[PDB]
Amino acid sequence: STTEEQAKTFLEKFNHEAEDLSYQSSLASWNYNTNITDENVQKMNEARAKWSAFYEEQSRMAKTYSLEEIQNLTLKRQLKALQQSGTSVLSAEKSKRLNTILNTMSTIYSTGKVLDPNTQECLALEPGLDDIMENSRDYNRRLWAWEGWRAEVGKQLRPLYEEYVVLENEMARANNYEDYGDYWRGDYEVTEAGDYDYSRDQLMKDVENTFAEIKPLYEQLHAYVRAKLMDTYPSYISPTGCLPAHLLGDMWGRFWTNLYSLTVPFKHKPSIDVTEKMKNQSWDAERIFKEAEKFFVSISLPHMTQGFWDNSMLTEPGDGRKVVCHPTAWDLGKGDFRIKMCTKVTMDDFLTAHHEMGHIQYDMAYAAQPYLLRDGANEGFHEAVGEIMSLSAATPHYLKALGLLEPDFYEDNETEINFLLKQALTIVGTLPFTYMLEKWRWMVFKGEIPKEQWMEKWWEMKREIVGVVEPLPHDETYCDPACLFHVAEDYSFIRYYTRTIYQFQFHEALCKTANHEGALFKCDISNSTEAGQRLLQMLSLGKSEPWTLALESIVGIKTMDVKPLLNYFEPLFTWLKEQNRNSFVGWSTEWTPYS
Amino acid sequence: NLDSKVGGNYNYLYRLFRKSNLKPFERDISTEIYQAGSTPCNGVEGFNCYFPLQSYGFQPTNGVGYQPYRVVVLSFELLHAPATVCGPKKSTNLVKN
Ligand SMILES: *[C@@H]1O[C@H](CO)[C@@H](O[C@@H]2O[C@H](CO)[C@@H](O)[C@H](O)[C@H]2NC(C)=O)[C@H](O)[C@H]1NC(C)=O
Ligand SMILES: *[C@@H]1O[C@H](CO)[C@@H](O)[C@H](O)[C@H]1NC(C)=O
Ligand SMILES: *[C@@H]1O[C@H](CO)[C@@H](O)[C@H](O)[C@H]1NC(C)=O
Ligand SMILES: *[C@@H]1O[C@H](CO)[C@@H](O)[C@H](O)[C@H]1NC(C)=O
């Protein structure tokens, strides 16, 4: 008999077999240090080994099943997930040296151990690396920390990672794959499929078009941001001077929310609060979380289970019973879902509950599918849906639905705090980084030409595209491309290309269905009872359908588009033009970083 | 409530891999290895023959669909026998004169 029926027949068993061990893998993600440890870490570490070991036996016999001669992708998508070749192409001798590279930076790079004279300021996360910048602006950190951090990192991390770059890509050329990067987009690129022979053809020209209109507006924005930064330290922060990447609130300075504090436009202006209940009322977050669910199911989001309600907290007991601040989707399955996050009394964690507990509702939205198919259309779709409503949490328009304060309270039009601009700093500040970080790793894994140009070309476009000029040029002793938290640990950065755009595409659609164009940032998502009667079909489809068909119901497009970002900055830009007239747009090109 | 504990209750026996479907008012007790393929494996678990028996894992934290349920089917028949399995409970208090 043909293996076609046998292959599906094992899939019935395989679905049940996968579910049992997956529960064990996600049994505990915080039970490590909260109390004493009778046995905590090795409990699920072995379970993942058992699940991986059982997976290997399942995957190995799945190859005998007929992967080819399957003209329809309705069920072959479940076959391909298990029948992936994976790491099994390598030999035993090849596989032994791979783990040697993985543990190289696991210790020296994870914690910063660089000597400082008298220990004025050590280069480590302790004590309070990020918070010490918001109160102290010491000059020594601004120059000495640049040299010292990578001195103890690049000595050994540069040559060891060469083996994975070249030698581990021999099998990719065997399977026509360009690199591991093409392996990361295995689900995006589907060939030999009827009517769904879809590839990433836009990867030839996606890079150029989206950044054409960004640069003219990006140059204008940095002038206004740097304008308020002159009075902090004019000796180094000057219109001629440029701020290196380590001087933007982190050792790498990718997120620029730390820059808000020094750019306060009006210190004498009286300030109102989003909640305005710091009194004997004693506002409880769980009550508002219950009050926020109605908006979440206003767009037909399936109700998250009683596990969170049965077990949660409002005030920390301050005992061994504690939950560490780990934001992670609980893919427990079997009908079990529990939300246990840092439900403290903080305003910051209030806003993100839309991504903390409200984003979780997507897990069981496609629970009808098996465990393998219980996912979104792609990686970007899953992440971007949770960010649609997060930006309107601090809106006073959101408070009107709450009803805690006066429902008839006046809505001020003094929206001129840099808080509005601060939201753009994280979104647009890291856009040029993700823009050219992946381009460096695309051809470099191929290794078609030598490594005589890997370093100097790495430092070519970054000195003018983002306006960051390093005070000290880096050498082979500095593995700057391998000095990131993700390149060294082999994390797929290709998600950022799609996750960023689709969030505004998802968000603009909701504002389109809410008859609110123009002020995208002021999207009136409250009382959005008018959106649940159409978007309910998209939750059910899950991975059973291509993302191309699902995208028509919100924007009616087949590609990635940048229209929502244009109208985001227009209300801010009108007030931004008048205060930037003294300072020239942009920065000096190829200036001397030393001065 | 009374049939769930951590680790899963495996006492109940069910199968989801049988050569043919069942019939109305029919009971199947015998179990054979699910030899889906044409190649006989001589009744040894592996390729082309899967294990027929299976068991639900009934931990208490399972969802409502996974929650075990006890269902009773009350079948009624009339094979033209004088047998009766009912009886009235209506009797008003008697009065006199
Ligand atoms: C959202 O819309 C609802 C009606 O669809 C309104 O809220 C109700 O308003 C009436 C008064 O007109 C009150 O009696 C109800 O108690 C309100 N219900 C709720 C759930 O608030 C109002 O237009 C909006 N509600 C807001 C902004 O809270
Ligand atoms: C403290 O108590 C439990 C009891 O088993 C322990 O296993 C775990 O580490 C801690 N529980 C939580 C919820 O932190
Ligand atoms: C086509 O779809 C059916 C639907 O169940 C699936 O079973 C089958 O594996 C798919 N591929 C074929 C028939 O090649
Ligand atoms: C703020 O100004 C806008 C016009 O830009 C106006 O529509 C709104 O009513 C004003 N809000 C006030 C005065 O509270």
With helix as H, strand as E and coil as C, how does A153-173 read?
CHHHHHHHHHHHHHHHHHHHH
Beta bridge partners of B14: B54
Extract the runs of DSSP E, i.e. beta strands, from A33-153. none
Over the Cα atoms of chain A, what is R_g? Answer: 26
- Residue given tokens 């009339």 in the structure block: B78
DSSP A302: P
DSSP A374: -
Position in ligand 2 atom list of the atom nearest CA A31? 9
Three-class DSSP category at A319:
coil
Spatial contact of A141 and A120, defined as CB atoms under 8 Å apart: no
Q: Does the Cβ of A401 fall within 6 Å of ligand 1?
A: yes
A26 in contact with chain B, both atoms CB, cutoff 8 A? no
Q: Does the Cβ of A594 fall within 6 Å of ligand 4?
A: no
Q: Which two tokens stand for residue B19?
A: 């050569």
Distance in angstroms (rounded) separating the CA atoms of residues A200 and A189: 6
Q: Which residues contact A233 (CB under 8 A, 6 or more apart)?
A: A137, A139
How many Cβ atoms are within 10 Å of A505's Cβ, its own excluded?
22
Q: Which two tokens stand for residue A521?
A: 């940032």
A311 in contact with chain B, both atoms CB, cutoff 8 A? no
B50 in contact with chain A, both atoms CB, cutoff 8 A? yes
B87 in contact with chain A, both atoms CB, cutoff 8 A? no
Task: Name all contacts of A145-150 with Cβ < 8 Å and 24+ positions apart.
Answer: A145/A121, A145/A246, A145/A251, A146/A244, A146/A246, A146/A470, A146/A471, A146/A472, A147/A472, A148/A114, A148/A116, A148/A123, A149/A112, A149/A114, A149/A123, A149/A246, A149/A251, A150/A474, A150/A478, A150/A479, A150/A480, A150/A483
B10 in contact with chain A, both atoms CB, cutoff 8 A? no
Q: Which residues in chain B are closer than 8 Å to A338, comparing Cβ atoms?
A: 61
How many Cβ atoms are within 10 Å of A4's Cβ, its own excluded?
12
Distance in angstroms (rounded) separating the CA atoms of residues A332 and A19: 9
B85 in contact with chain A, both atoms CB, cutoff 8 A? no
Q: Does the Cβ of A527 fall within 6 Å of ligand 1?
A: yes
Position in ligand 4 atom list of the atom nearest CA A410? 14
Helices (H), chain B: none
Q: Distance from the CA of A340 to the center of ligand 2, in angstroms?
A: 13
Q: Distance from the CA of A498 to the center of ligand 1, in angstroms?
A: 37
Please name the amino acid found at residue A227. A
Rounded to a whole number, what is the distance in Å from the CA of B61 to chain A's nearest CA? 6
Cα–chain center distance at A365? 21
Cis peptide before A127 (omega within 30 of 0): yes
**A 47-76 residues inside an 8 A Cβ radius of B:** 61, 64
Q: Which two tokens stand for residue A393?
A: 């949490």
Spatial contact of A343 and A313, defined as CB atoms under 8 Å apart: yes
Which residue, among A8, A13, A21, would best test binding to B if mutated, counting the most B CBs under 10 Å from its CB?
A: A13
Q: Which two tokens stand for residue B10?
A: 């495996």
Single out the residue of A351, A127, A137 nearest to residue A249, CA to CA. A137
Rounded to a whole number, what is the distance in Å from the CA of A13 to chain B's nearest CA? 8
Nearest CA to ligand 1 atom 25: A401
Rounded to a whole number, what is the distance in Å from the CA of B45 to chain A's nearest CA? 12
Which residues of A belong to the active site? 356, 486
Would the CB atoms of A1 and B37 count as touching at under 8 Å?
Answer: yes
Please name the amino acid found at residue B73. V
* Residue contacts between A and B (CB atoms, under 8 Å): 42
> What 3 state SS string does A492-537 have?
CCCHHHHHHHHHHHHHHHHHHHCCCCCCCCCCCCCCCCCCCCCCHH
B56 in contact with chain A, both atoms CB, cutoff 8 A? no
Three-class DSSP category at B50:
strand
Three-class DSSP category at A61:
helix
Q: How many CA atoms lie within 13 A of A130 on its CB side?
A: 9
Spatial contact of A155 and A260, defined as CB atoms under 8 Å apart: no
Burial A77-103 (b: 16+ CB within 10 A, else e): bbbbbbbeeeeeebeeeeeeeeeebee
Sign, CA dihedral B27-B29-B33-B39, equals: negative
The resolution, in angstroms to one decimal, equals 2.7
B66 in contact with chain A, both atoms CB, cutoff 8 A? yes
Q: Which two tokens stand for residue A220?
A: 């204008």
* Burial (CB count <10 Å: 0-12, 13-18, 19+), residue A153: buried
Rounded to a whole number, what is the distance in Å from the CA of A336 to chain B's nearest CA? 5
Would the CB atoms of A13 and B51 count as touching at under 8 Å?
Answer: yes
Would the CB atoms of A5 and B48 count as touching at under 8 Å?
Answer: no
Taking phi over 0 as left and psi of -120 to 50 as alpha, with beta for the rest, A253 belongs to left
Would the CB atoms of A64 and B47 count as touching at under 8 Å?
Answer: yes
Residue of chain B whose alpha carbon sits nearest to that of A62? B47
Nearest CA to ligand 4 atom 7: A413
What percent helix, strand, coil does chain B show, rounded to 5?
Answer: 0, 10, 90
The ligand with the least distance to the CA atom of A74 is 3
Distance in angstroms (rounded) separating the CA atoms of residues A392 and B75: 59
Q: Which two tokens stand for residue A319?
A: 């005992």
Q: Distance from the CA of A519 to the center of ligand 1, in angstroms?
A: 24
The ligand with the least distance to the CA atom of A415 is 4
Nearest CA to ligand 4 atom 5: A413
- Among A39, A321, A323, A339, name the best residue to mutate to test ligand 2's pocket (greatest count of ligand atoms within 8 A of Cβ): A321
What percent helix, strand, coil does chain A show, rounded to 5?
Answer: 45, 0, 55
Cα–chain center distance at A426? 11
How many Cβ atoms are within 10 Å of A378's Cβ, its own excluded?
19
Spatial contact of A159 and A107, defined as CB atoms under 8 Å apart: no
* Burial (CB count <10 Å: 0-12, 13-18, 19+), residue A569: buried
Over the Cα atoms of chain B, what is R_g? Answer: 24
Distance in angstroms (rounded) separating the CA atoms of residues A381 and A206: 18
Spatial contact of A478 and A150, defined as CB atoms under 8 Å apart: yes
